Amino acid sequence: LRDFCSVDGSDLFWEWNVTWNTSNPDFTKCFQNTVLVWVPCSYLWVCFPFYFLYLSHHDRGYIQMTHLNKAKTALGFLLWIVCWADLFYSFWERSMGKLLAPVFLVSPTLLGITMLLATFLIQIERRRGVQSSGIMLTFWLIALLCALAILRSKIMTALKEDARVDVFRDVTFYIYFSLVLIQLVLSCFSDRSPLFSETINDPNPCPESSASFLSRITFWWITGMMVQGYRQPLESTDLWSLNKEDTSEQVVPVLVKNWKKECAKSRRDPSLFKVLYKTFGPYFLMSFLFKAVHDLMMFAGPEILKLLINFVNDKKAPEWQGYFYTALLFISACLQTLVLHQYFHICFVSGMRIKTAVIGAVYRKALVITNAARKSSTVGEIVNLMSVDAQRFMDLATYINMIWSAPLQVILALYLLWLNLGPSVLAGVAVMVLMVPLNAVMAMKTKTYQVAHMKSKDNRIKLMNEILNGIKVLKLYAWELAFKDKVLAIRQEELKVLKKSAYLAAVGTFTWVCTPFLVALSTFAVYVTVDENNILDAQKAFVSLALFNILRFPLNILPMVISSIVQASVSLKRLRVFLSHEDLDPDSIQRRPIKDAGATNSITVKNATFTWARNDPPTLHGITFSVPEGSLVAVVGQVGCGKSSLLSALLAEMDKVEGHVTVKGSVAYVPQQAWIQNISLRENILFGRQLQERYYKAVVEACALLPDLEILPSGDRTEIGEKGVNLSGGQKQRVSLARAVYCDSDVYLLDDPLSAVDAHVGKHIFENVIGPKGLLKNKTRLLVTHAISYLPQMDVIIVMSGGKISEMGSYQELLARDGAFAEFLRTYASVKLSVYWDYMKAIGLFISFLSIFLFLCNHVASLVSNYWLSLWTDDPIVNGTQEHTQVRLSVYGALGISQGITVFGYSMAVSIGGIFASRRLHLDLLHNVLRSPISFFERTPSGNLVNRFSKELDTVDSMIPQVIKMFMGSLFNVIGACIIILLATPMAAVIIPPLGLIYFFVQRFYVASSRQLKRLESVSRSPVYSHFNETLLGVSVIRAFEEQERFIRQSDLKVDENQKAYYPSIVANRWLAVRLECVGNCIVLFASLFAVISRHSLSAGLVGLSVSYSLQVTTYLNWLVRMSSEMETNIVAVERLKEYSETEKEAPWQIQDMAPPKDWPQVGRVEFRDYGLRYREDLDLVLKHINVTIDGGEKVGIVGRTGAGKSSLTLGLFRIKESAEGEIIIDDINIAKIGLHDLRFKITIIPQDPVLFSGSLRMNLDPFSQYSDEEVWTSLELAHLKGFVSALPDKLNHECAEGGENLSVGQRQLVCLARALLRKTKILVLDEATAAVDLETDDLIQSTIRTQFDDCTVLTIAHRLNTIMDYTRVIVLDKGEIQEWGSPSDLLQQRGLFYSMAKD
Ligand SMILES: *[C@@H]1O[C@H](CO)[C@@H](O)[C@H](O)[C@H]1NC(C)=O
């Protein structure tokens, strides 16, 4: 090996005297001229073949011949030349006689070949569309570093006066060096974008496909957006456009193809795992490569620390080895950071692609499912496939690799702790084996308690929705406090479960914070006690600690990853069982264009049997009927003959068990269950088509849409709201028919459309759109309908029976032949820093001080424990042994035990404070809302209230405490590392200014932009799920109008808009990570460097402490900025839950100082002193000096035309809104001065709402639970329902469904009647109750009045004048002024407005 570098093999290859053990280090000549030349060449060669395979299988176009790349190839040639120059000189010497070894001829040969390959790679790169190449930049970096070694070597060996350095090879090498420097300087630039670029036209293209290699691996291309986020906000129009590789159009087809292939090779169910692997695996193995490199380099720290400590001990060492070590430490750290975050990028991008592909596949699949499939599940479970499952497949990609990484890191760490610390490391492995059962049990019971929390919060959410709906009823009856207490009890159960979770979380924090210390104590005890000879130097500790600090994470993350793989396995089963469903047959109903003149009837069927399942009783049996072109046919039959199925069959919903059908032309469908999208009514109608003003106006004036818009606020542009804000049944039917009539298709399959419309508007719709002279006069129109008042105007009427077509023919023959239809007719027709203070005050100032104190204790104890381990490592060896071992181990264990006790203390304290604050903020939100006037409920949307009670409160309950823990922990770890550093090597304060204040103000831009981006992401995730719901609901329409491509495209566009926000957030995380990890690596470098500058003073255990802490700052800083961002996002929940604490609340409820007597409703007098109310200040009063002093016991009604205000009469009676003017006095009492409940109780009411609540009917009969079953049944019987009451399973405890759906309409009516009876106050009311209940209930109330309510004054608002006919008096009014009073009969005799209505 020496005959190669020297003729006689003289100049050695590695003489430690020259390279390591000297104050002036320098590689030998053999080394310079073999290995320092074979490193870069070897690199380029090892990366050439695979790089070429890549540039073959990945092109970006072709790049014009620019300048930069010209100069690059020119320098490559000059390098080839100035490298073969050495070879020509070498042969000039060989031939000329001197005996020269192989090296002096083989080195320049390889160098020249590799420079030529550098030129060839530049040209291949240019022809493959690569602007900035990572392989070339790295090759030039390696070459330049090796060349800098060789160049220092030559410069030294030349400056001396003794040796006459060769002028020739030295000149050639100076040349090679300048050229490689310029080539590296030119590898960091970019070329001119390729000339075949197709996405250049996009105004906002992702800045990544055009970014340097340096900007990429440092994610520097998001600095623009992160600074923009600070200077001014980020809306959805600054979000870049997705890379083409991340769009749904270039992601979903590949997964769909692979899935079809797997299924085809199946027809052993298809394994979605194999497909996800075959699709997203190529891009996901690079994650394995980067993670492997990161794992192997995470262990350079501990080893370079072992070397550095051996240095600080060896005080005969040359001062430059400590610098070599500080440099290697810095460089390993920085490579680890870049590699790690490239891996994280790959994983997050692969999860993003998986989610896009899955949402797309699910959506495209729902539109082909056979009806049986969609029945085999619910709509909620088919939308979860998007909402829960795909999110799991997404969030898993980022951790899955730990399955194999965590064991590798733990194994390397154990092997190193062994190689360093002997067979004692079993003492730590034993604690680790006992952390796995605990972590497993805890991760189990955490889910066990989360399930209970969710099942108990869904109940509260349901009750809260019911209350926010029946706000009015509850506010009238005075039932506020009862529902308050019910919801509070459900809350208490939730809180108990959450406290259990708090104990579990406390134990978890104990583990995460005290794993390294427990492991270290076990190891050190077993080591210093199993043998006296064992000495605890600064190298066995402070190298073992590092391995512990980098062992905790694997241990504590492995159980979470296991549980998440399990959850994802369940999700994958669900998703596969969906994507495997049987699909409809596209070719069962064979169609034909509108011009193919084969058959002259738009429809023909031959004995076709149909069914909704594979083996059930076919609903339709042997049909045959051919509807000629344009002929209007109308199928009729008793309910359940097979009517509603002929349409669903022609539309290809059912399964053609046997037969043959064909439909010629474009179809149109108007099913019985109308389907209306969440867009503008006009947008619905046009159904995505070029508006043609004339035809739109026509179709709208046809189906009687004009009288419909007149009420809806904005007109046809009226956004129908949250899935049909206000539209009503007949309205929805008309809108659907408008859609069908606009589409203007050949065959119109009308499925009992006009059913929900009255006879009059119905006949209009027929005559205008369906009739023989309507809009569809020249369309082949079917009609499966009930109303027999049109069949004459028809063309053919078909009737069936139990799925068999009874008889067909014209109405003429239909009547003549006296056939079945004869029977059918004859039968049927027969943050400003105060949010945080508020959260702290809700937790309680004491518990806050306690949490801070216990944190401080934990961390002062940890720090002093480590300074103790240091002072222990510095114990002198006296007589081959270490003194003070007993004392030191005792104190170390004591400090650690105290640390653990304090970590448990503060975790439990912060969690118990979380419980206190959850309880308090919830109670206050509840009380404030329940006190808000009804105005606050009409104005503010129910969405806001439901959101505060669900999500804002979930944040205050189960997210803030954890974030507070992680934030405080990261903050104090950073502060502690900094204390240890500044104390070991005090001349490091000169790094804090230049390194924290100015590169820890990266968090300005991060926090700022990350907030906007998280918002944009969560504001854009619901659209996908709403679309998918709205598509599952109306899939028959979408499938019958041939509008499937449009909807697939809209799903893709929504998924892409969501990704356009999800992608910059991930990259912002990588931005922050690289920046703050660079800061942490600078901390590592500076601590190590100031420990080297000052050896002679520092103590050789202090250095280990300092560097060991420097090696954790790196992760702590990043987690700290992330948790600051989270605290800024989550704390706003405390400002949300406090919104309604200053909103105008209603008047006081109880007034004891002016308390009303027990018999407050003594006389039932009705004094009206020109009172006046107006819904709002801006509007006009609706009571115009209303005046009457009604005596008690009376029985009078209140009637008025539209805009009369009797409704207002009520609203003001109970004081739902304060008195706008005037007065309303009773029994010498100005109700405006009485206590809200002090009056509401004694004034009965039968609100015009049969609204029940989720409870045992007894609850409705008595929410307060202040009524006895005796009088309960007394009412029920008296209430004319006691019979079916006893008919209930639980006589008085028959708990009903939500809203009282288990009771009939008249049922709930009688229910209100009994409510009033039980109340049995002095005075009562019945607001338009006769207009929503048969005469039975109205008359039963009248009988209760003449017999049970005779004593009760009565002012009643009803439209059925007869409902007040026999009443004592009567009054009306308009424009806010009382119209006429006194008896009703005298009114009629007066021929007044009452006489008018009577004429009506
Ligand atoms: C290292 O050792 C050899 C003798 O073993 C000696 O000749 C050589 O000069 C030493 N290296 C240096 C730089 O002195």
Curated annotation (Swiss-Prot):
The gene is ABCC1. GO terms for cellular component: basolateral plasma membrane. One of its GO terms (molecular function) is ABC-type glutathione S-conjugate transporter activity. CDD domains: ABC_6TM_MRP1_2_3_6_D1_like, ABC_6TM_MRP1_2_3_6_D2_like, ABCC_MRP_domain1, ABCC_MRP_domain2. Residues 603-827, 1166-1400 form the ABC transporter domain. GO terms for biological process: cyclic nucleotide transport; glutathione transmembrane transport; leukotriene transport; lipid transport; positive regulation of inflammatory response; response to xenobiotic stimulus; xenobiotic transport. Its EC number is 7.6.2.2, 7.6.2.3. Pfam families: ABC_membrane (PF00664), ABC_tran (PF00005), TMD0_ABC (PF24357). Gene3D superfamilies: ABC transporter type 1, transmembrane domain, P-loop containing nucleotide triphosphate hydrolases. ATP 1 binds at G637, Q638, V639, G640, C641, G642, K643, S644. MK 571 inhibits sphingosine 1-phosphate and leukotriene C4 export. Residues 1-31, 94-98, 153-170, 297-322, 421-423, 528-549, 862-898, 984, 1098-1099 are extracellular. The lineage of its organism: Eukaryota, Metazoa, Chordata, Craniata, Vertebrata. Residues 284-567, 848-1129 form the ABC transmembrane type-1 domain. It is a multi-pass membrane protein. This is Multidrug resistance-associated protein 1. It catalyses: ATP + H2O + xenobioticSide 1 = ADP + phosphate + xenobioticSide 2; an S-substituted glutathione(in) + ATP + H2O = an S-substituted glutathione(out) + ADP + phosphate + H(+); sphing-4-enine 1-phosphate(in) + ATP + H2O = sphing-4-enine 1-phosphate(out) + ADP + phosphate + H(+); leukotriene C4(in) + ATP + H2O = leukotriene C4(out) + ADP + phosphate + H(+).
